[PDB]
Nucleic acid binder design. Sequence first.
RNA 1: CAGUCGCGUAAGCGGGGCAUAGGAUCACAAGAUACAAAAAGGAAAGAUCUUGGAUUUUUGGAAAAGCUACGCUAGGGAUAA
RNA 2: UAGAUGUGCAUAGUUAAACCGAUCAUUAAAAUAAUGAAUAGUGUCUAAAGUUAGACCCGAAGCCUGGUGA
RNA 3: AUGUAUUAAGGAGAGUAUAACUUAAUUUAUGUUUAUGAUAGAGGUUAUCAACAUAUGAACUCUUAGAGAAAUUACUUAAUAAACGAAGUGAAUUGAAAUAUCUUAUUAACUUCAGGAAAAGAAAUCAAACGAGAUUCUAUGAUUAGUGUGAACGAAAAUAGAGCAGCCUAUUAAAAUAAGUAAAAUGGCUUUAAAGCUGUUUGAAUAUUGUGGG
Lengths: 254, 54, 243
Amino acid sequence: ITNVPVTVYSFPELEPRSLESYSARHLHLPLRRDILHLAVIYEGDSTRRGMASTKTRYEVHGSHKKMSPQKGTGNARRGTRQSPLMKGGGKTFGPKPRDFSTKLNKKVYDLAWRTALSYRYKRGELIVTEDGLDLPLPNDFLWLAGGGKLSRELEDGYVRKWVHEFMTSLNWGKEAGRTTFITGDKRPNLFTGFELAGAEGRALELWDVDVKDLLETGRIVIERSALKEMIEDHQSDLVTRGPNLGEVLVRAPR
Amino acid sequence: TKHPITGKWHNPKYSLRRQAELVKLAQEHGVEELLPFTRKLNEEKLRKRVELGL
Amino acid sequence: ASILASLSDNRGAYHKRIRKGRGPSSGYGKTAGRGTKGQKAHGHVKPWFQGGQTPLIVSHGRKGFVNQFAADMSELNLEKLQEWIEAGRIDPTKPITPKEIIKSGIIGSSIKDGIKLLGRGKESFKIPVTITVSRASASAIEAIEAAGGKIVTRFYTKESLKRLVEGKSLHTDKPLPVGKEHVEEILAQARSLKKKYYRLPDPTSRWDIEYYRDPAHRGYLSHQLAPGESPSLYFKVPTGGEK
RNA sequence: CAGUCGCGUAAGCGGGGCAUAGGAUCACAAGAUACAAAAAGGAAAGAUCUUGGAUUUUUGGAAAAGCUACGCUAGGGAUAA
RNA sequence: UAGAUGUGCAUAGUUAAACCGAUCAUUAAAAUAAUGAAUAGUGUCUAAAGUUAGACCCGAAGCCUGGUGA
RNA sequence: AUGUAUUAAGGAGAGUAUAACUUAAUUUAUGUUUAUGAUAGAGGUUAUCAACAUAUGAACUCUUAGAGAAAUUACUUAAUAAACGAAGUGAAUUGAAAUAUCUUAUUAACUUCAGGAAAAGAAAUCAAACGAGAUUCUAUGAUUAGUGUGAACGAAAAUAGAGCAGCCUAUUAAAAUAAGUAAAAUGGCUUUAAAGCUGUUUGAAUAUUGUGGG
Ligand SMILES: [K+]
Ligand SMILES: [K+]
Ligand SMILES: [K+]
Ligand SMILES: [K+]
Ligand SMILES: [K+]
Ligand SMILES: [Mg+2]
Ligand SMILES: [Mg+2]
Ligand SMILES: [Mg+2]
Ligand SMILES: [Mg+2]
Ligand SMILES: [Mg+2]
Ligand SMILES: [Mg+2]
Ligand SMILES: [Mg+2]
Ligand SMILES: [Mg+2]
Ligand SMILES: [Mg+2]
Ligand SMILES: [Mg+2]
Ligand SMILES: [Mg+2]
Ligand SMILES: [Mg+2]
Ligand SMILES: [Mg+2]
Ligand SMILES: [Mg+2]
Ligand SMILES: [Mg+2]
Ligand SMILES: [Mg+2]
Ligand SMILES: [Mg+2]
Ligand SMILES: [Mg+2]
Ligand SMILES: [Mg+2]
Ligand SMILES: [Mg+2]
Ligand SMILES: [Mg+2]
């Protein structure tokens, strides 16, 4: 079928509440390892610093006088002291500060984004939820932490213990790969919870996600609004002239 | 403005470049009717062409 | 196992890297494919060098010149104009002007010095349209009118064609009038628009004026001529008779 | 092949010589061409075609004398003591 | 929300060049008389390359400028 | 190495609690918070078992008064490196497979002058019949136009980004609108023949009611 369903769950309980429909060219593309490779490698060339530097014979300190006479000493005739053949001479083809980034077509970079998003869809590792995707930390702890009764040492020691036991019950923790939470905005509970308990997963903002981040954990837990904005920003090859982008089949029973 | 005592033609207070920046800045706020006669006025530019032509 | 540890480009995309000066068995060992103690091994030869013999461009010379004043028209044919209309990418009911010819993609994504309508596929063109370009071939003018259409060749520049796409200039198929009996009506229009629009330039040189002054090209200045008058600003039609 | 001339009854022959021994470009100069003309009308200087002046004779085309036993450097040792 | 903006290459060939144009150029007028030229591009990566930069590496005698020393 | 921020004179000699710095070489006081901090004791040499913020005493000699063999003399509340900037003068190695024009190169270097920056700057500018609207920095435009026998050299318009600011009543005190000037001949520079710089000899005009430059 041209379109594929997407069940929207309530995050804490994971109850299917709504059903959305996307096109097969969004979450049902074939697995292209060559195109996923070009994209993941195109992102590594951009995050690289490329500031390494080395001094050539034309930058090494010292005078450019001739070391030994052209002939008469019997030793091999030598020129300046900054030659690579000397002890403290310069490296001829040494590293230099340059740009390692390469180019990747926007259409090819968008196809690689929807191919990594479909690789997770067919394997069941793409678990979309409703909005407000934050860890449901207990109310008592939030009341004490906000109040300031609890010290930092206890405030952090609890978040680590609760997030570990919450992810283990869901089979979502370190014992089962890990999970990545992708939300539109930064939520205190979520982003703070996965900062102290990082072995159980991580959290990211929609703008801080790459094609390499979708493929780096066991599962992807994304918000409904985040996904609709994630596939709508990487359909350049599709929107050229539309396809199902968030079409609702079953509405949430208010 | 020729000076009466010195008989010298004082250069205009606003140069031809600046006259074009006033006509272009006044036309953005609809205040082109208040500036004095200028060769850079959009109506003077057009009137001179239609009247005389190339 | 993991996906990121199982990705790679197709084998046909990878090619052998030749590192010279890294052993005899590599095949590029000592000499590094340079030979033995020549000028190509010790230094560098000037590319233009032929050993001393004079080149042919010095023995024959350079022929001709490069015209730096010729206009770079954007060629457009009728075989392609009909395809855009059948696809619904150009509305034939409305006037087809350079703004709508450049934004549709028929001539490409480059705005050049003009647009010329050519007559390739003039036999299967039967759509009545109202097109306006900078030039048109003799076979394209009668092919447009044979189907029941109208064509007009206006004068454009590279800058004026860009303002039409940007909306900074309104398109018009008529030249600016001349005389004191038109200021009241032309100045009236400018105020009503309530915007700073630029005007489309009119030809100034002799050749440019003459091209749009004859009905053979359907020039928009052809209405200034009399039936017996000639387009040329210098030559005149001699009179036939014995006297 | 087109153009248009000579000779010949005609067929036909004629794009120099029975054959084999006379160098370009650039610059410069004389004709034609009507191509472009740096705001525009002209022009200048350019472009195409034809042609001319060359021990351009180191004739694929530098305006060009020697000495060093005080010699220098990079090389080869085509044998040079 | 709506509209505009930001190099480039290709889409048409032809000639010295324009006009011209699926036709164009020489034929001093033109004309299937002759001769030539016509149809998938564009971006990216891997590799090998031409060009300009020290340019595969090491090595002169010398030349110029500013200083030093009786 | 790059980026961001801040700042805009540097060195040496000798002495001294050898983490502590100037013959006072470990000065003297304030305010706040102090384990819920900040990022109910012992301890003044068995020391500085307190951080932050704001004040504060002292700080020698030379470079650096004059002289001289700098760190001395003799006097006295004597005192300012380099790089960067503008102008002047101005090469050679190198390339052209030699070499004179050319290139190297408005380069290196030197000389003077000036500041935390300097220089430049609100069109006698560019454009082309439509219009743009000061200067500076970056890229594209551009192995382009063009120049040159060649080798090579090489713009501008425009576009994008960084910044944005206009004025003469200049936010620091200036014009009664510019004459030996514009320009011409000639010798050079720059360069495409224009514009621009210049020694010598000469030498204009007075605003779109069309005077003057391009
Ligand atoms: K090779
Ligand atoms: K060798
Ligand atoms: K030569
Ligand atoms: K050129
Ligand atoms: K001059
Ligand atoms: Mg040296
Ligand atoms: Mg080293
Ligand atoms: Mg790579
Ligand atoms: Mg191969
Ligand atoms: Mg081999
Ligand atoms: Mg080889
Ligand atoms: Mg060889
Ligand atoms: Mg020769
Ligand atoms: Mg002209
Ligand atoms: Mg001119
Ligand atoms: Mg020879
Ligand atoms: Mg021969
Ligand atoms: Mg032998
Ligand atoms: Mg073409
Ligand atoms: Mg002194
Ligand atoms: Mg003293
Ligand atoms: Mg530039
Ligand atoms: Mg004046
Ligand atoms: Mg002068
Ligand atoms: Mg002039
Ligand atoms: Mg002048």
